[PDB]
UniProtKB/Swiss-Prot annotation:
It comes from Mycobacterium tuberculosis (strain ATCC 25618 / H37Rv). HAMAP family: NaMN_adenylyltr (MF_00244). It is an enzyme of class 2 (transferase). This is Probable nicotinate-nucleotide adenylyltransferase. Keywords: ATP-binding, NAD, Nucleotide-binding, Nucleotidyltransferase, Pyridine nucleotide biosynthesis, Transferase.
Length: 192
């Protein structure tokens, strides 16, 4: 059992890392591969290497986390379908569990095949405390498909990349929202 964590990580923060650990405890995953996403699907975010290196810095110290550049190296916006194909090729031993934010998930289903996407992995959306499903396509999708698609509330996902981005812009402290390495990387590279 191998977790797959997409995707933007701009910046990565404790919420993401809490979500990875929770979802691994739940589902008894042996490892979690973080996959920073490629180009955006609308033609403004940080450079792929910045997001990759932030993700590597944040996860380095965890024995059961890794970072893959499968989406980064591919070029273009990249389909989730390919992520899993590439990650199935390198981990043929394990069944995959793709996991991502609730809103990001509702943008993958949702422009791609889904029917063929659920053949490749079980799906585990992670959501902030106050989450209410408003997307009716997903509500419909749910009736179709135990347990192809789960949602797991993560209190820590109250912390968001958008807030961290606004806080860095406003020179407001990012301390304790993310590892010291990430905050200082964000600061040094003046990412926002």
């Amino acid at each position: 059992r191998l977790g797959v964590m997409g995707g933007t990580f701009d910046p990565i923060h404790y919420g993401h890392l809490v979500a990875a650990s929770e979802v691994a405890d739940l589902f008894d995953l042996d490892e979690v591969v973080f996959v920073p996403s490629g180009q955006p699907w609308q033609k403004q975010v940080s450079a792929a290497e910045h997001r990759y290196l932030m993700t590597v810095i944040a996860t380095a110290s965890n024995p059961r986390f890794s970072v893959s550049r499968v989406d980064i190296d591919r070029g273009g916006p990249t389909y989730t379908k390919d992520t899993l194909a590439d990650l199935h090729a390198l981990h043929p031993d394990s069944e995959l569990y793709f996991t991502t934010g609730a809103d990001a998930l509702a943008s993958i289903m949702s422009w791609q095949g889904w029917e063929e996407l659920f053949e490749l992995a079980r799906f585990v959306g992670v959501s902030r405390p106050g989450y209410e499903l408003r997307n009716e396509h997903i509500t419909s999708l749910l009736g179709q498909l135990k347990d192809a698609l789960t949602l797991v509330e993560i209190p820590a996902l109250a912390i968001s990349s958008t807030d961290c981005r606004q806080r860095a812009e406003q020179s407001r402290p990012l301390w304790y929202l993310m590892p010291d390495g990430v905050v200082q990387y964000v600061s040094k590279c003046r990412l926002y």
